[PDB]
Design a protein around this motif. Structure first.
Motif, PDB file in Angstrom:
ATOM      1  N   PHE A 210      -2.863  -8.968  12.018  1.00 30.51           N
ATOM      2  CA  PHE A 210      -1.416  -9.033  12.223  1.00 30.51           C
ATOM      3  C   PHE A 210      -1.043  -8.875  13.686  1.00 30.51           C
ATOM      4  O   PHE A 210      -1.740  -8.200  14.435  1.00 30.51           O
ATOM      5  CB  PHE A 210      -0.725  -7.894  11.464  1.00 30.51           C
ATOM      6  CG  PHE A 210      -0.341  -8.230  10.055  1.00 30.51           C
ATOM      7  CD1 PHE A 210      -0.399  -7.251   9.068  1.00 30.51           C
ATOM      8  CD2 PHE A 210       0.094  -9.508   9.713  1.00 30.51           C
ATOM      9  CE1 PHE A 210      -0.039  -7.540   7.756  1.00 30.51           C
ATOM     10  CE2 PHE A 210       0.452  -9.806   8.404  1.00 30.51           C
ATOM     11  CZ  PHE A 210       0.382  -8.818   7.422  1.00 30.51           C
ATOM     12  N   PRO A 253       5.935  -5.137   2.207  1.00 33.92           N
ATOM     13  CA  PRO A 253       4.508  -4.924   1.919  1.00 33.92           C
ATOM     14  C   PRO A 253       4.188  -4.901   0.422  1.00 33.92           C
ATOM     15  O   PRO A 253       3.117  -5.379   0.056  1.00 33.92           O
ATOM     16  CB  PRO A 253       4.217  -3.552   2.534  1.00 33.92           C
ATOM     17  CG  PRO A 253       5.257  -3.350   3.527  1.00 33.92           C
ATOM     18  CD  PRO A 253       6.488  -4.068   3.058  1.00 33.92           C
ATOM     19  N   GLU A 254       5.098  -4.373  -0.404  1.00 34.52           N
ATOM     20  CA  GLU A 254       4.924  -4.329  -1.860  1.00 34.52           C
ATOM     21  C   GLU A 254       4.752  -5.712  -2.453  1.00 34.52           C
ATOM     22  O   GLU A 254       4.013  -5.890  -3.413  1.00 34.52           O
ATOM     23  CB  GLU A 254       6.126  -3.686  -2.567  1.00 34.52           C
ATOM     24  CG  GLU A 254       6.569  -2.341  -2.034  1.00 34.52           C
ATOM     25  CD  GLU A 254       7.696  -2.472  -1.035  1.00 34.52           C
ATOM     26  OE1 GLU A 254       8.813  -2.008  -1.331  1.00 34.52           O
ATOM     27  OE2 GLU A 254       7.454  -3.031   0.051  1.00 34.52           O
ATOM     28  N   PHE A 262       5.710  -9.366   6.728  1.00 39.27           N
ATOM     29  CA  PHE A 262       6.716  -8.491   6.121  1.00 39.27           C
ATOM     30  C   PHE A 262       7.484  -7.621   7.126  1.00 39.27           C
ATOM     31  O   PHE A 262       7.001  -7.380   8.231  1.00 39.27           O
ATOM     32  CB  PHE A 262       6.078  -7.598   5.028  1.00 39.27           C
ATOM     33  CG  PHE A 262       5.019  -6.641   5.542  1.00 39.27           C
ATOM     34  CD1 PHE A 262       3.670  -6.898   5.323  1.00 39.27           C
ATOM     35  CD2 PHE A 262       5.369  -5.480   6.225  1.00 39.27           C
ATOM     36  CE1 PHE A 262       2.678  -6.021   5.786  1.00 39.27           C
ATOM     37  CE2 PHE A 262       4.390  -4.602   6.692  1.00 39.27           C
ATOM     38  CZ  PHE A 262       3.041  -4.875   6.472  1.00 39.27           C
ATOM     39  N   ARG A 355      -4.950  -7.685   7.177  1.00 38.22           N
ATOM     40  CA  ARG A 355      -3.532  -7.378   7.040  1.00 38.22           C
ATOM     41  C   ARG A 355      -3.216  -6.073   7.766  1.00 38.22           C
ATOM     42  O   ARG A 355      -2.660  -5.147   7.178  1.00 38.22           O
ATOM     43  CB  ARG A 355      -3.126  -7.289   5.563  1.00 38.22           C
ATOM     44  CG  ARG A 355      -3.456  -8.514   4.729  1.00 38.22           C
ATOM     45  CD  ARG A 355      -2.555  -8.708   3.518  1.00 38.22           C
ATOM     46  NE  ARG A 355      -1.409  -9.554   3.846  1.00 38.22           N
ATOM     47  CZ  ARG A 355      -0.143  -9.164   3.819  1.00 38.22           C
ATOM     48  NH1 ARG A 355       0.180  -7.928   3.467  1.00 38.22           N
ATOM     49  NH2 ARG A 355       0.805 -10.017   4.150  1.00 38.22           N
ATOM     50  N   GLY A 356      -3.566  -6.017   9.049  1.00 38.19           N
ATOM     51  CA  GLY A 356      -3.358  -4.832   9.863  1.00 38.19           C
ATOM     52  C   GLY A 356      -4.088  -4.886  11.190  1.00 38.19           C
ATOM     53  O   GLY A 356      -4.327  -5.963  11.730  1.00 38.19           O
TER      54      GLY A 356
ATOM     55  N   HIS B 225      -1.709   2.045   2.612  1.00 39.94           N
ATOM     56  CA  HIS B 225      -1.684   1.190   3.801  1.00 39.94           C
ATOM     57  C   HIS B 225      -0.886  -0.066   3.448  1.00 39.94           C
ATOM     58  O   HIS B 225      -1.242  -0.770   2.499  1.00 39.94           O
ATOM     59  CB  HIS B 225      -3.104   0.824   4.253  1.00 39.94           C
ATOM     60  CG  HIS B 225      -3.972   2.008   4.563  1.00 39.94           C
ATOM     61  ND1 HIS B 225      -4.365   2.326   5.846  1.00 39.94           N
ATOM     62  CD2 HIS B 225      -4.534   2.941   3.755  1.00 39.94           C
ATOM     63  CE1 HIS B 225      -5.128   3.404   5.816  1.00 39.94           C
ATOM     64  NE2 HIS B 225      -5.244   3.798   4.559  1.00 39.94           N
ATOM     65  N   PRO B 226       0.209  -0.323   4.169  1.00 38.22           N
ATOM     66  CA  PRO B 226       1.110  -1.445   3.845  1.00 38.22           C
ATOM     67  C   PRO B 226       0.398  -2.785   3.666  1.00 38.22           C
ATOM     68  O   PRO B 226       0.802  -3.580   2.808  1.00 38.22           O
ATOM     69  CB  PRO B 226       2.077  -1.501   5.037  1.00 38.22           C
ATOM     70  CG  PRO B 226       1.589  -0.496   6.025  1.00 38.22           C
ATOM     71  CD  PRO B 226       0.686   0.457   5.324  1.00 38.22           C
ATOM     72  N   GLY B 227      -0.652  -3.018   4.453  1.00 41.00           N
ATOM     73  CA  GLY B 227      -1.442  -4.232   4.352  1.00 41.00           C
ATOM     74  C   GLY B 227      -1.945  -4.535   2.953  1.00 41.00           C
ATOM     75  O   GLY B 227      -1.996  -5.698   2.559  1.00 41.00           O
ATOM     76  N   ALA B 229      -0.576  -3.053   0.122  1.00 38.55           N
ATOM     77  CA  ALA B 229       0.432  -2.425  -0.736  1.00 38.55           C
ATOM     78  C   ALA B 229       0.827  -3.183  -2.014  1.00 38.55           C
ATOM     79  O   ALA B 229       1.374  -2.576  -2.942  1.00 38.55           O
ATOM     80  CB  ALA B 229       1.687  -2.104   0.084  1.00 38.55           C
TER      81      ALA B 229
END
Ligand code: ZN
Ligand code: ZN
Ligand code: ZN
Ligand code: ZN
Lengths: 410, 411
Positions: A210, A253-254, A262, A355-356, B225-227, B229
């Motif tokens: 990201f 994120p959900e 997001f 994703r991070g 961790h939102p990634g 989630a």
């Protein structure tokens, strides 16, 4: 290779409590890490590697010098010695399930269980040797499977006299608190490119992450005695709810997966007089990343319209890290060797976005392009973390092959 | 009456720093209040009142004994000795504006202004004597104007030999931080009814206040961790945002007035894992009050509908105080005498609600019904605080007359 010696090595690292802690000025953040760092330093010396240096900030570097003649580019492999603060890393008591038969695995003696209903991956791991926890702790395959693999790979290159150029190795202190790249001395590491061995299941390769920014919102309201509030009181929390309402709820994120970015509200605090909001913004694509920033600003102005000079909404936006893709694709050989290596070892490469953030993604923007190699491990940072021994063997075989394949092109 | 003495007396109390402090265990909260308390104690003894006591918690009580024989009920007069934390009460610099001629008033050497454009009640007070701040502090008319009026009434009652029964007086310590009635010894005070002299403009009488309850909402979410989630994360802050969307926006302090009640979000704090909301409920009606309690429940059930057992919404409702109305109206003579007195004094009584709580409100439930009487002051709790000397004299006249009319109804 020697599957018993690999497992034993790994179980020895796992037995050491090396868990990180956030909010600590010192690096490494905790004592336990020094114990693994120092054990590793001795092990590297004992393995015959040269220029073994452990910095004052807990970064460990070493070199297995070129096997053969020729101008081979120097390459690196990187792991971190710490485990996630989310769950205990102390007295990990691993369970070993040989010839896994695709059922529920009981973690310890209790109502904690590793089950394919919860984790369908297990369905695909029949007949493998699974290493799990006992329910009380993390395992620490993340990232000590990585460490054991790098160490084993080093041994293999020597004992099997496989041609290779200079191989650089580093073991970092506080990855789980994002401090795993801060003190990384890229000049001393002296590698053209590198790989963190810090991923998941067999075949995973990662060169994308990201783009990140914090969007911090300060809201100043006006607060009087609620009874006489009419036409005077301005509630900062009411504006805060207005802001949040305009933020695309589906782009959270959900509800988001794969490559889809997001907005996310991480924390907030407030009264009528003043509220503060902490948003994060995430996007693989940079234009979208910027477009996302623009949205938050649009929401701030919309909600801000009407407020008398004494009341206002203020946004501070601050980039945290970027997508390393560009710095990796800039050099086709990096991902090509990695994928050729896997394919040679009969592994199908599984390209997967981070994703991070990763240590490598920071290193990439520091002169050290650095994608992520798999580890064989699953379900990280929790009590349902496990690893297959065979996954770990394949991760050794890939590191070795990358080393081997790099030599052929030099 | 000597307006000179009344003014001088008021200014002497005004000069004393007696600003109260919130979140303090000791009562009173500040040293300065003791200075006013002790000043008044000596003053009350010096006025010939009997049974003067000052408790270890700072409530001062005294009695002017019955002037005349008879089964005349004992009545009380209460004011508080502290000023608001909202603005400074230290070295107040009152300005005396004689024969107010209707313009803006300059507050001190600067650019702070008391102006009828900002406060149109000033168009109603021409010719009267205004006392303002210097723009740098509170005035403290709230409630040192009331103290000065009570003390003067006691003097008038004596100097003019006006028939009266037992007159109870009290000066409480921590009114502006909610403790003003916490340590009030009702039995010892020994009055059948009382009045707080803590209202506003001439004619104001108050016997109705909000019912109050706090609503504390606990939200337990689920953080990862939102990634990773998706399908797993449950944002506590998202659930709070949903609850807030359900609470009637129009029924808020910013939109309400007079007798209309409200929901209010005073404060909140949270992350993905956990959020806590602090609501308050206000209503003059007992039933509507409970309806608001029910709506908060209606909301929390709905927003929590669908959640997995690891996550939930937990409401805790707690009454803070109630409307004193029933306790006051129960004895029609309390408001009647109060209202008559003002009429005897050429004042038209004006009944308006307290959009909050008073000491009297609590007292009214501790066995001492206790409406609120005007002071003549305005714009309380800030630098635009002012009072008129003539308004304060009217308040004295009303007090004396209440005492007087109570002695006529010996029953
Ligand atoms: Zn890791
Ligand atoms: Zn990790
Ligand atoms: Zn008051
Ligand atoms: Zn007040």
């Amino acid at each position: 290779m020697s599957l018993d010696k690999l497992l034993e090595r790994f179980l020895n690292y796992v037995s050491l409590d090396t868990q990180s802690k956030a909010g600590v000025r010192q690096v490494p953040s905790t004592e336990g890490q020094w114990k693994l760092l120092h054990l590793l330093k001795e092990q590297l010396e004992e393995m015959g590697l040269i220029n073994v240096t452990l910095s004052e900030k807990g970064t460990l570097m070493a070199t297995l010098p070129a096997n053969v003649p020729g101008d081979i580019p120097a390459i690196g492999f990187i792991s971190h010695v710490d485990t996630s603060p989310d769950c205990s890393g102390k007295n990990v008591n691993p369970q070993i399930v040989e010839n896994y038969r695709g059922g529920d695995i009981a973690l310890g003696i209790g109502d904690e269980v590793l089950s394919p209903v919860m984790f369908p991956v297990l369905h695909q791991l029949l007949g493998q040797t699974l290493i799990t926890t006992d329910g009380k702790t993390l395992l620490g395959a993340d990232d000590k499977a990585g460490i054991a693999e790098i160490m084993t790979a080093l041994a293999v290159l020597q004992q099997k006299k496989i041609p290779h150029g200079d191989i650089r190795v580093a073991f970092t202190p506080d990855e789980e608190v994002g401090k795993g790249a801060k003190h990384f001395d890229v000049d001393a590491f002296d590698a053209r490119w590198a790989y963190t061995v810090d991923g998941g299941g067999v075949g995973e390769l990662e060169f994308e992450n990201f783009n990140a920014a914090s969007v911090n919102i300060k809201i100043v309201g006006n607060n009087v005695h609620p009874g006489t509030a009419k036409g005077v009181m301005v509630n900062a929390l009411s504006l805060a709810a207005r802001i949040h309402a305009e933020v695309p709820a589906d782009e959270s994120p959900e509800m988001t997966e794969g490559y889809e970015g997001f907005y996310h509200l991480a924390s907030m605090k407030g009264t009528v007089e003043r509220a503060d909001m902490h948003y994060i913004i995430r996007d693989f694509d940079r234009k979208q990343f910027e477009a996302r920033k623009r949205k938050m600003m649009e929401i701030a102005k919309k909600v801000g319209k009407g407020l008398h000079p004494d009341c206002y909404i203020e946004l501070v936006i601050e980039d945290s890290y970027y997508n390393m893709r560009e710095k990796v694709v800039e050099h086709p050989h990096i991902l090509d060797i990695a994928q050729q290596a896997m394919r040679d070892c009969d592994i199908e490469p599984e390209l997967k976005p981070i994703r991070g953030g990763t240590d490598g993604a920071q290193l990439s923007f520091m002169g050290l392009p650095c994608p992520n190699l798999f580890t064989g491990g699953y379900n990280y940072h929790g009590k349902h973390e496990f690893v297959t021994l065979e996954g770990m063997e394949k991760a050794v075989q890939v590191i070795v092959r990358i080393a081997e394949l790099t030599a052929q092109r030099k």
